[PDB]
Structures are given as C-alpha cells and as structure tokens.
Amino acid sequence: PQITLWQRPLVTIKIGGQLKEALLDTGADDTVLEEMNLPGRWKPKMIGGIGGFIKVRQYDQILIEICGHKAIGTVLVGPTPVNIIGRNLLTQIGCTLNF
Amino acid sequence: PQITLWQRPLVTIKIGGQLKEALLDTGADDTVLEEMNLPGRWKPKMIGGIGGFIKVRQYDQILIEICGHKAIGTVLVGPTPVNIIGRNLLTQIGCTLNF
Numbered sequence: 477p478q479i480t481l482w483q484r485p486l487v488t489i490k491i492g493g494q495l496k497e498a499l500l501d502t503g504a505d506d507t508v509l510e511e512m513n514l515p516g517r518w519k520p521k522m523i524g525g526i527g528g529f530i531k532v533r534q535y536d537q538i539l540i541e542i543c544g545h546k547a548i549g550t551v552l553v554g555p556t557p558v559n560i561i562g563r564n565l566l567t568q569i570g571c572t573l574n575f
Numbered sequence: 576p577q578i579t580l581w582q583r584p585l586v587t588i589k590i591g592g593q594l595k596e597a598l599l600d601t602g603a604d605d606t607v608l609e610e611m612n613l614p615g616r617w618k619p620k621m622i623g624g625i626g627g628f629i630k631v632r633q634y635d636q637i638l639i640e641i642c643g644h645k646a647i648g649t650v651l652v653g654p655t656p657v658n659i660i661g662r663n664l665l666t667q668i669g670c671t672l673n674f
C-alpha cells in the first residue's frame with residue numbers, strides 16, 4: 477500500500493502469537509517494542525533517542541508478519557512509549573520513501 | 576526521489592541562510608533541529624521521544640527548503656542528537672511511505 481503521512485503510519489503486526497499495532501519508522505535504525513512475552517535467550521543492550529538512553533533486551537531471529545508480510549529480525553524489547561518498526565525490518569518488507 | 580531504507584534517509588536542507596543534513600522521519604510528529612541560530616521570537620515546549628522528554632524552543636512559520644522543495648512550518652530547536660524532518664513538514668513536500 478501507499479501511505480500518506482497526514483496521520484501516524486500505524487500497521488498491525490503479529491509477533492509471538494500476539495497482535496499489536498506499530499509505527500513504520502524511517503528514523504529508527506532498530507525495531508523496539510513495548511514489553512511483552514517473547515521466548516528465548518536475549519542479550520542486554522542500551523539504545524538512545526531524544527531524551528536519552530533506555531535499557532532493552534535483544535532477540536535475534538524473531539519472526540514478525542507486518543501489515544501482513546513475514547520478516548525475521550532483531551527485535552529489541554523494553555521501555556518504549558510506542559512500538560517502532562525500524563529500518564532493519566522496513567528494508568525486508570521492501571518499504572521506500574517517495575516524494 | 577525514491578529513497579530505499581538501506582542507509583539512514585538523510586537529505587540536505589536549507590534553513591535560514593544555513594545548509595544542514597537532516598533525517599526524513601515518519602516516526603516524528605514534529606521537525607526538531609539541533610541548536611541553531613534562527614531569527615525571532617520562539618516559545619518553550621517539551622517533547623517526549625524514546626528515552627524521555629527534552630526542552631526545546633519553538634518556532635512557527637519558518638521556511639525550509641527540503642531537497643529543493645520549499646515548505647513552511649513549525650521548527651523546534653533544541654538538544655536532539657540529529658536534525659529530524661517530521662510529519663508536519665513531510666506532508667507538505669508530498670512524501671509517502673510505500674511497500
């Protein structure tokens with residue numbers, strides 16, 4: 477689909493059995509989601525945005541169906557206000573910015 | 576143009592006499608630029624991003640040339656790590672997200 481930006485670009489994603497709404501974010505290098513129950517071992521990481529640094533858990537090899545499209549990537553889980561799909565997965569669903 | 580997300584979408588901008596590089600960000604409702612030298616009255620405002628909230632000075636009706644597109648809107652100047660072009664200016668130059 478073609479998405480105009482008059483509203484926030486929100487899409488439904490299905491991750492580990494759960495359905496969530498998330499932001500197609502061109503300014504996020506990483507995908508960070510709010511806390512949830514994801515299986516597997518994870519690594520401790522820290523990331524920064526406006527306002528500073530948050531501590532997150534990284535999970536590699538996770539599968540996500542974005543606005544119905546499958547992709548597998550590193551998903552960082554931890555204290556974010558909104559769920560963010562960043563460039564590591566956006567390039568997997570063939571997303572482009574057009575103007 | 577058509578920008579693929581394999582690298583950060585940086586575009587050259589012209590804001591008040593000066594040349595800067597900024598990120599095209601669909602996860603940002605506002606345009607936030609790093610501490611610059613802008614003419615005028617500005618008003619305080621606080622914004623939240625993933626690691627917290629920052630105090631920025633707000634500017635309205637500021638002209639910006641984003642890639643040869645002149646657009647006019649509110650520009651927030653403050654302590655951001657990178658200059659961000661958010662949806663309030665992205666819609667003016669006709670920028671869409673596509674997949």
Ligand SMILES: CC(C)[C@H](NC(=O)[C@H](Cc1ccccc1)C[C@H](O)[C@H](Cc1ccccc1)NC(=O)OC(C)(C)C)c1ncc[nH]1
Binds near residue numbers: 507602
């Ligand atoms: C991993 C993501 C979260 C992170 N990116 C962001 O936080 C980017 C900005 C940035 C890019 C590069 C370096 C620093 C900051 C911002 C996102 O677009 C965020 C996503 C979000 C939406 C709504 C509420 C809270 C957060 N937007 C945001 O911070 O809002 C403003 C208006 C201040 C830009 C990032 N990308 C690269 C390094 N860190």
